Write a protein that binds this ligand. Structure first.
Ligand SMILES: OC[C@H]1O[C@H](O[C@H]2[C@H](O)[C@@H](O)[C@@H](O)O[C@@H]2CO)[C@H](O)[C@@H](O)[C@@H]1O
Length: 385
């Protein structure tokens, strides 16, 4: 035996969400009960953990287990904040294959998943019955029913935001970065390809034909849906509690089939990661498994409402027979992980600006995308190491 038994392990969990924190406190508590190892759960906001570990880790005051959305994994790995976990393939196979890809980087695994999210078709049950079967039917519904003058819409979403419009680009075969055997090439950006132009042509139609507000934001979409005058939006699970609090009877379905295939959305995965500064990688990895078991994640789902990308649980009635969860899970099963390489960080601004220029009719799809990609490629070589 080499790794000595730790007196304590430290876990950082979301500070802003009470139920997420208390669920982790529960299962950390059960681990302590089982093993006699103290597990301290410290409240730290998800998007503050990476910065805090950069300071506290080297100081010897860092957590053993940390958590944040997977899209910033690349930054963490390259800067040496995290170390790989060593678990058998049987452990990986407890979880959704695509969710596990999100937590893999440079041919190494960095964590086990807690939650998966994707946009889907969220609809007002008083306004929509059977959801459109195809994208063509959905767009026709928008053209027929969108009335900006009366603040009433058939379909309304953040069509000027690439996170939301990704499915339109993916439908045409467009990629952000060229993928080769798990590795993304930051130098081969696909966002000004002919495929990408076809995607942006669809985006343009939402403003030229479906009459969407040309400077819309998240609050425009959410406010109007909560007003009871919007039949359907394209949005994620993060908006559900707000919609229900407003009195909307909410339905959720996968996005209608587009260009003959399932719609492909981005998925975001929140996992547990292992600090590179942990003195107890083996014991901490045992804790990580304990926190992500079938039992632990069933409990986590019921408390937090966040879909656990755990194979058995995804097939459980707790997911499949829940009217505000099932649709998200179905859509998530057809999605792809948001790129996690550091270079993705500087893609959002230029690509979203390109959406704005197209929406406002200031530039053609081709012109806007060409400009956006030029901007990206300059930003990639700028401050990045
Ligand atoms: O506007 C681009 C934006 O996209 C993503 O943000 C998502 C977020 O991940 C979801 O949790 C949800 O809130 O919808 C957001 C859409 O704005 C990226 O995570 C973000 O970095 C990027 O700026």
């Amino acid at each position: 035996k080499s790794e000595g038994k730790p007196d304590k392990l430290v876990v950082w969990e979301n500070a802003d969400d009470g139920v997420q924190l208390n669920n982790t406190k529960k299962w950390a508590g059960e681990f302590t009960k089982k093993t006699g190892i103290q597990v301290e759960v410290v409240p730290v906001a998800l998007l503050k953990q990476q910065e805090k570990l950069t300071l506290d880790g080297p100081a010897g005051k860092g957590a053993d287990l940390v958590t944040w959305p997977h899209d910033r994994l690349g930054e963490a790995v390259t800067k040496g904040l995290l170390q790989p976990i060593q678990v058998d393939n049987s452990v990986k196979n407890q979880f959704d294959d695509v969710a596990m890809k999100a937590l893999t980087y440079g041919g190494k695994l960095y964590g086990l998943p807690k939650a998966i999210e994707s946009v889907a078709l969220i609809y007002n049950k008083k306004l929509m019955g059977q959801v459109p079967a195809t994208y063509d039917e959905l767009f026709q519904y928008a053209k027929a029913n969108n009335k900006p003058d009366e603040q009433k819409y058939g379909v309304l979403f953040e069509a000027n935001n690439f996170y939301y419009t990704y499915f339109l680009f993916a439908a045409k075969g467009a990629a952000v970065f060229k993928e080769q055997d798990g590795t993304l090439d930051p130098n081969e950006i696909g966002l000004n390809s002919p495929e990408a132009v076809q995607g942006m042509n669809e985006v343009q139609k939402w403003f030229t034909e479906a009459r969407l507000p040309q400077s819309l934001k998240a609050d425009t979409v959410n406010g109007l849906f909560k007003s009871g005058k919007v039949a359907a939006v394209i949005n994620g699970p993060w908006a559900i509690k707000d919609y229900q609090a407003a009195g909307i009877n909410v339905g959720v379905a996968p996005l209608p089939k587009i260009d003959g295939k399932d719609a492909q959305t981005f998925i975001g995965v929140k996992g547990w990661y292992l600090s590179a500064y942990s003195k107890y990688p083996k014991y901490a990895t045992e804790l990580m498994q304990f926190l992500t078991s079938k039992e632990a994640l069933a409990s986590r789902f019921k408390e937090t409402g966040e879909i656990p990308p755990q194979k058995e649980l995804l097939n459980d009635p707790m997911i499949k027979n829940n009217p505000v969860v099932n649709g998200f899970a179905k859509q998530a099963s057809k999605g792809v992980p948001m790129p996690s390489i550091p270079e993705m960080g500087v893609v959002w601004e230029p690509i979203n600006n390109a959406h704005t220029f197209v929406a406002q009719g200031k530039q053609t799809p081709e012109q806007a995308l060409n400009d956006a990609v030029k901007i990206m490629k300059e930003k990639i070589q700028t401050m990045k190491q």
